[PDB]
Design a protein around this ligand. Structure first.
Ligand SMILES: [Mg+2]
Ligand SMILES: [Zn+2]
Ligand SMILES: [Zn+2]
Lengths: 1266, 108, 87
DNA sequence: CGCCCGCTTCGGGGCAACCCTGGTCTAATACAAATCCGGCAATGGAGTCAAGACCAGGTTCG
DNA sequence: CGAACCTGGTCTTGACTCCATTGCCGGATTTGTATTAGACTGGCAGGGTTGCCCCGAAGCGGGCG
């Protein structure tokens, strides 16, 4: 493995760095806390910027300035000591700090669990008392000497205890003689007898003090002797005076130290294999939490045993220095220097090490030396991670110093920021405006901006032409803007696509590519049909513009991300370039038919003829240009260049719908004729009224039948005709054009009488306050609906306010109801309903209290919108971070395992009634089973696309259940295959073999979450992927049988009689907010239940319904429930975008048995890898691990990946990494997340090896052509 | 408006010729713990026999060129600090008084 | 970063080097060798007229006469407008 | 039939990431080494001046 | 044709000069170190927020007499 940076690794092995490797990397021990000399501003000698250590700051310049040119290269100036090279190796070369006393890394010490204490089986507080110098610890004891000497030492211990006994005997005899003297001098002299007894009591206190004091001396003697017996390594010796009296008394027989040197010695005399086999035996034969604790220790013990690492590097002997350009000291205007906050930590460590070395070479009391070592230890710990232990080291303003771990963890860390994305050159941004004359593959561009974008291209072109004799003349021509430069700009712009980009990119259509064209002004003219995809209205929104440079990048933007190539959804395959408001209203006015219009065909032929027929639509056009024909009048033209609809064509001639040579009549409008002139010749006639749904169906049929270029040109022509008839439609808004219903006031009068009766009923006290609130809520909701019905019948259709909605351009009817009629009921700030309705329309003008009532709901809606777009960003973050490693990798996994789809379950009258969610579930999938009708004709073969006509065919055949293939059962391992993914929604053809459908699925799920209108809503969706427990946890059955339905006290107690041999399953906490599930009729007692039928109607948990109904149904439970939410908002998400995620969740099963090959209880490992090890272990020791499939949540399944580099961008990056270097887990760079970070060609789409390695060379016929 | 900075160093822009260089000697250096180090000096260059190597210590030249051994002096001792204020006979009388003190400790 | 690569002047410098090589190609062999070894453009070492006469077998005063000839030859604006542009 | 015992289970609690309800100090002195720098004062090679001598082939004349 | 001349480079010598190149000494300034004798001998930014896991007290069914 070479670090010479040749841009191919395919491997990245993190691991612990030894002290030998640290001193191997460096270029000399930095040994002074001097950064930059205050006067000369040159780096100091042997300090934190020393050019001899790291390198020169001036290019190929030695420090003294003797050698100064590139001829002197690769050498070192003998005077100044700086190797001559470039300045950018100062970014590269590390230095190290040698240490006088050893050091423990805080990343193995302050962890959960502390890996030091788990390797040495010690408490965390043991370590905080050892390497903070609060306790002693022995590392060895010569028991081979200690027993055969311990005989004689017991003899000497008994001798010395006899000596303390002789001392207390002589002391008590002296006190006995003193007490005898006190008695003999008290008896013969007359005083108070109590004073003599108290003199005896003082002597007695003295002799009891002597006897228990020398008793405790003897106790301390036998205590230090017993400690010498119980003298062993890994023993903590607190209070250290026992230690000091144990050093001199037989000091040779043990080795007790304190600190990092003691930890290093303990790791030194540590056969890891001994405790490895001991822990093997304990996890084999043990019981309880001692077994699981030995498992948790055995994890890291076998981790250290497995790789070629050693725990010697857990202590630290030399500390490396990050190269000084990464911690620069730049001065500013006025000489304002700017440090980088690591230099202070490095200065503190350097100073403390120098002081410690000085005190060690001097000779000092050990309190001072150990205190300096503790200060050094805290300094190193804060240098790696400030605030990991104790109080964080801060500076001026008490702001904490951004230490080394702070450059990795957190939002400002290297991983998150490098994942966040960088600013780019050849870019730019502007505000946008509409481009209603541009073609679809086109965007306007201001010449003042596109001149700034294409400056190198325009310089090269106008220096190739004679307008500049070098690039400098061309550059000053660009800045001074000679008028030929616009011509040169047009030359370099022609066929050179740019990228457009709105603010936040919710999904894949948020970045498109357009051919530019120069436009006067300063705003990006943008085609109006892509604002739906961008979600960019023209209220002042700004779009950024990037630019591809390479031939590969220009080809990628030209073929892949072109505007006309992306019309259909990634989500549901519906066209997103389908027209809207102005275009839809114009086409609606153009295609509606009004009876009695001018120039109408009448069949009246008495004396006069019928006068409604036209030989040509051009003749009709002249008849409309003259003031005779209204374009919405019924006429009978004879069309010759249009395909008649299928009935008239097939009945008119022999199925050869030859619309070039057709000649046929149609009783239509002129407008629908002119409208169907936009459509292709191969398309049949339409003869309908262009509702927006009808136009959606038309463009769907066009996209699924014709090539996309015809769809693009048709959509462009539709836009132009839509605007041209949007002008002539006359849809204005007048204050007279908002009519209020004349019977509004009587409606409000009658419902006010009902409300007054309810108010009187509450005023009697006949009902509670909440119930009269509910009564008024029901009364005014019914009143508002009645007002809406009266307004619906009152309005005529030519009213432009109702015409906009009735076309389907925009808006619901409720906006018209709030315009004229009644506002209705406005919510509380809490979300309750205000009992006073707003009985005035916005046309009539509100009153002040009504406006104050409406402001609550307005403010809450805006706050909800802000929180909803933030949470949707988070949800898409989680989904992309889970599903980013599912790309199509094989053409066909070729299993037969596939799910079954319902596909239009019938009616009891005999009708195969169409299920609503066919176009989201059964569409666009490859059939795994052949379709047969009672084994009659095989109607649809295995592996059809399941588009429209085969669905109609199976509907005619009557068969419903179709076992279709899906990604829930794709037999490929590395990602999914192609046929199990089915038809791509973006193309309508089969998915190509490199399309990252995980990111497509994640974006299509996370995108429309802002339109999700909020237990149910977006948090309910968010916990659903997260595999959380639902708060409204409706219970499920566990077995069939008749229920013992019973309702207790504030919560129900519903039991179930098992139909099988089993126990009567008790369900305990069934609160009153849950209700009996009505299915099939309402639930009843003794109703025979299913295996996993839901007890109450509500939210079932996914984890137990996995544990009951197996893994198949828990996919069908997850998919349909999540899709049920997006049904409620009218959002078409095809289920295969959901099914990508659910396959990612169930990748892992749980493991309880070790079996025969190295497993742990509760270990979550991959199903296929669990399957993989078992095949190699059923032979040679056939004891497999006891496995169980488990559902794991999104934020958890993301973190339990093998690629630690991808996992580093997720959470607390220390614990992602400290185990990773312990396990020496080499990343393989195979996910596309990591190849982004190292800038490798990502393996998805163009980067994969089947496409990247294409040899391109012309045909040998073509070489003979020239 | 925009605050700018400059790391105080010179940046040129030349051709990295890996062919047309000043030719050069290589001096092998041996440190105190036998560590080898090959410092590239120039051709026209006096080679110092002593050299602070990459090791973080002083590394002498691998040949027996005999550099200067010390050329230094001891800083000071606690005895020197003692001798600046006291007499030799003063310290000898204190030595005899502590000899008599250890005599009273031992056998008196 | 005011001490970073300005990146138009570097490619300008390379193009200036190539155009200067063309301009030296437009002159004779002795002239090109004299200017190249004089200003050290071919190696990085400006030698003197005595070294050029040492490698050329002629007087250093001959090198100074060749120098004056070449600098008079260079100072045609008709020849060096393309180099007047480069400053 | 009841008395003891580890397995399990839950509350206690023990503890890892984020934030912000949250400053003025004795004062020199002695000296020695290092270092900068400043001014004459040798250059001594490197550039400059100039004279003059080598002709070589156009230019012109007989 | 034979020959004088005219001006293109081409090269030599000889003198000159001129500005770097040390070089040394004298001084200026700058940086580091030693020493300042009455007495003085144990504290400070630190708390509150969120959440996740480690572990002892307790139910509790199995083992035991
Ligand atoms: Mg907007
Ligand atoms: Zn140097
Ligand atoms: Zn498959």
């Amino acid at each position: 493995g070479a670090m010479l940076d040749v841009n191919f690794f395919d491997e990245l092995r993190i691991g612990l760095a030894t002290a030998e490797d640290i001193r191997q990397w460096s270029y000399g021990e930095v040994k002074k806390p001097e950064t930059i000399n205050y006067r000369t501003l040159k780096p100091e000698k042997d300090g934190l910027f020393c050019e001899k250590i790291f390198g020169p700051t001036r290019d190929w310049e030695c420090y003294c300035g003797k050698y100064k040119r590139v001829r002197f290269k690769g050498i070192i100036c003998e005077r100044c000591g700086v190797e001559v090279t470039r300045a950018k190796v100062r970014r590269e070369r590390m230095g190290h700090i040698e240490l006088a006393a050893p050091v423990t890394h805080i990343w193995y010490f302050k962890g959960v669990p502390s890996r030091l204490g788990y390797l040495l089986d010690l408490a965390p507080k043991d370590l905080e008392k050892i390497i903070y110098f609060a306790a002693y610890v022995i590392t060895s004891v010569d028991e081979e000497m200690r027993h055969n000497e311990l005989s004689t030492l017991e003899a000497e211990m008994a001798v010395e205890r006899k000596a303390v006994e002789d001392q207390r005997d002589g002391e008590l005899e002296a006190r006995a003689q003193k007490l005898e003297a006190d008695l003999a001098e008290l008896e013969a002299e007359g005083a108070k007898a109590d004073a003599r007894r108290k003199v005896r009591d003082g002597g007695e206190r003295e002799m009891r003090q002597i006897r228990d004091r020398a008793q405790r001396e003897l106790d301390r003697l036998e205590d230090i002797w017993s400690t010498f017996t119980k003298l062993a390594p890994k023993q903590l010796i607190v209070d250290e005076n026992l230690y000091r009296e144990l050093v001199d008394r037989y000091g040779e027989y043990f080795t007790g130290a304190m600190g990092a040197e003691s930890i290093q010695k303990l790791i030194e005399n540590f056969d890891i294999d001994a405790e490895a086999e001991s822990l093997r035996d304990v996890i084999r034969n043990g019981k309880g939490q001692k077994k699981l604790r030995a498992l948790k220790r055995l994890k890291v013990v076998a981790a250290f045993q497995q790789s070629g690492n050693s725990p010697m590097g857990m202590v630290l002997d030399a500390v490396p220095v990050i190269p000084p350009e990464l911690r620069p000291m730049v001065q500013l205007d006025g000489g304002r220097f700017a440090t980088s906050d690591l230099n202070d930590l490095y200065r503190r460590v350097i100073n403390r090490n120098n002081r410690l070395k000085r005190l060690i070479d001097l000779g000092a009391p050990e309190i001072i030396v150990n205190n300096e070592k503790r200060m050094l230890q805290e300094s190193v710990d804060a240098l790696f991670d400030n605030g990991r232990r104790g109080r964080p080291v801060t500076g001026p303003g008490n702001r904490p110093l951004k230490s080394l771990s702070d450059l990795l963890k957190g939002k400002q860390g290297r991983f998150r920021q490098n994942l966040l994305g960088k600013r780019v050159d050849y870019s730019g941004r502007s505000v946008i405006v509409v481009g209603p004359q541009l073609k679809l593959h086109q965007c306007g561009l201001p010449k003042l901006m596109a001149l700034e974008l294409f400056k190198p291209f325009v310089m090269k072109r106008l220096v190739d032409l004679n307008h500049a004799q070098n690039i400098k003349s061309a550059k000053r021509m660009v800045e001074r803007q000679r008028p030929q430069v616009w011509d040169v700009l047009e030359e370099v712009i022609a066929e050179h696509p740019v990228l457009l980009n709105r603010a936040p990119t919710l999904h894949r259509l948020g970045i498109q590519a357009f051919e530019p064209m120069l436009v006067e002004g300063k705003a990006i003219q943008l085609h109006p049909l892509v604002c739906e995809a961008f979600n960019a209205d023209f209220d002042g929104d700004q779009m950024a513009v990037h630019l591809p440079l390479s031939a590969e990048a220009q080809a990628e933007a030209r073929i892949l991300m072109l505007s006309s190539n992306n019309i259909l959804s990634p989500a549901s395959g519906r066209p997103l370039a389908m027209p809207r408001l102005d275009m839809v209203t114009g086409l609606y006015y153009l295609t509606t038919e009004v009876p009695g219009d001018t120039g109408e065909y009448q069949p009246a032929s008495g004396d006069h003829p019928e006068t409604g027929v036209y030989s040509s639509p051009a003749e009709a056009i002249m008849a409309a240009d003259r003031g005779v024909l209204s374009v919405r009048a019924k006429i009978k033209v004879r069309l010759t260049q249009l395909r008649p609809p299928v009935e008239i064509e097939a009945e008119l001639f022999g199925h050869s719908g030859w619309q070039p040579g057709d000649a046929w009549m149609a009783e239509t409008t002129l407008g629908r004729v002119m409208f169907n002139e936009l459509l292709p010749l191969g398309y049949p006639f339409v003869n309908k009224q262009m509702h927006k749904k009808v136009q959606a169906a038309i463009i769907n049929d066009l996209a699924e039948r014709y090539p996309m270029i015809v769809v693009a040109q048709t959509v462009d022509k539709l836009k132009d005709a839509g605007f041209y008839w949007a002008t002539r439609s006359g849809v204005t808004v007048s204050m007279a054009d908002v009519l209020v219903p004349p019977r509004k006031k009587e409606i409000l009068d009658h419902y006010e009488e009902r409300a007054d009766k309810v108010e009187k009923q509450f005023q009697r006290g006949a009902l509670n306050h909440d119930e009269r609130n509910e009564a008024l809520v029901e009364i005014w909701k019914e009143a508002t609906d009645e007002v809406g019905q009266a307004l619906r019948e009152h309005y005529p259709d030519d009213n432009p306010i109702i015409t906009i909605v009735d076309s389907g351009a925009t808006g619901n009817f409720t906006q018209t109801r709030t315009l004229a009629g009644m506002k209705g009921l406005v919510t509380n700030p809490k979300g309750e309903f205000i009992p006073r309705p707003v009985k005035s329309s916005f046309r009539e003008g509100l009153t002040v209290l009504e406006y104050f009532i409406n402001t609550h709901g307005a403010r809450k809606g805006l706050a909800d919108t802000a929180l909803r777009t933030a949470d949707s960003g988070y949800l898409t973050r989680r989904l992309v971070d889970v599903s980013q490693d599912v790309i199509v990798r094989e053409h066909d996994c070729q299993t037969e395992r596939g799910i079954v789809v319902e596909l239009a379950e019938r009616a009891p009258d005999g009708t195969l009634i169409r299920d609503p969610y066919i176009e989201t579930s059964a569409y666009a999938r490859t059939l795994g089973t052949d379709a047969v009708d009672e084994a009659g004709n095989v109607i649809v073969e295995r592996g059809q696309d399941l588009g429209d006509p085969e669905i109609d065919a199976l509907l005619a055949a009557g068969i419903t259940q179709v076992k279709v293939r899906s990604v829930l059962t794709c037999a490929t391992s590395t990602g999914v295959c192609a046929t199990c993914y089915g038809r791509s929604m973006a193309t309508g053809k089969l998915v190509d073999i490199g399309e990252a459908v995980g990111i497509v699925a994640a974006q299509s799920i996370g995108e429309p979450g802002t339109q999700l209108t909020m237990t149910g809503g977006l948090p309910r969706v968010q916990e659903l992927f997260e595999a959380r427990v639902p708060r409204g946890k409706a219970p499920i059955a566990d077995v069939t049988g008749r229920v013992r339905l019973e309702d207790g006290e504030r919560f129900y107690k519903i039991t179930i009689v098992p139909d099988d041999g089993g126990e009567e399953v008790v369900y305990d906490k069934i609160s009153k907010r849950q209700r009996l599930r009505v299915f099939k009729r309402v639930l009843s007692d003794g109703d025979h239940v299913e295996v996993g039928q839901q007890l109450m109607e509500g939210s079932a948990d996914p984890h137990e319904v996995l544990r009951v109904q197996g893994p198949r149904e828990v996919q069908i439970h997850l998919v349909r429930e999540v899709q049920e939410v997006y049904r409620a908002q009218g959002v078409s998400i095809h289920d295969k975008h959901i099914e990508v995620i659910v396959r990612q969740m169930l990748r892992r099963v749980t493991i309880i048995d070790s079996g025969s090959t190295e497993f742990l209880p509760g270990s979550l490992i991959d199903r296929a890898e669990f399957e993989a090890e078992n095949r190699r272990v059923v032979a040679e020791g056939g004891e497999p691990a006891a496995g169980r499939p488990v559902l794991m949540g999104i934020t958890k399944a993301s973190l339990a990946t093998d690629s630690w580099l991808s996992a580093a961008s997720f959470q607390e990056t220390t614990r992602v990494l400290t185990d990773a270097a312990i396990n020496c887990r080499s990343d393989k760079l195979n996910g596309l997340k990591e190849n982004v970070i190292i800038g490798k060609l990502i393996p998805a789409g163009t980067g994969i090896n089947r496409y990247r390695n294409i040899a391109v060379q012309p045909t040998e016929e073509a070489r003979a052509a020239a | 408006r925009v605050l700018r900075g400059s790391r105080l160093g010179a940046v040129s822009y030349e051709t990295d010729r890996n062919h047309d260089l000043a030719p050069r000697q290589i001096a092998r250096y041996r440190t105190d713990n036998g560590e080898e180090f090959e410092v590239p000096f120039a051709d026209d260059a006096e080679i110092p026999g002593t050299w602070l190597c990459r090791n973080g210590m002083e590394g002498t030249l691998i040949e027996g060129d005999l550099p200067e051994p010390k050329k230094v002096k001891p800083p000071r001792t606690h005895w020197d600090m003692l001798l600046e204020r006291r007499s030799i006979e003063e310290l000898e009388e204190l030595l005899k008084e502590r000899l008599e003190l250890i005599r009273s400790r031992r056998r008196g | 970063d005011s001490e970073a690569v300005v990146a138009v002047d570097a490619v300008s410098f390379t193009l200036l080097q190539d155009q200067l090589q063309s301009v030296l190609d437009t002159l004779s062999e002795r002239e090109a060798g004299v200017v190249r070894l004089r200003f050290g453009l071919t190696d990085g070492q400006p030698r003197t007229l005595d070294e050029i006469g040492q490698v050329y077998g002629v007087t250093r005063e001959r090198i100074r006469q060749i120098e004056s000839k070449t600098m008079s030859k260079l100072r045609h604006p008709s020849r060096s407008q393309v180099l007047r542009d480069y400053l």
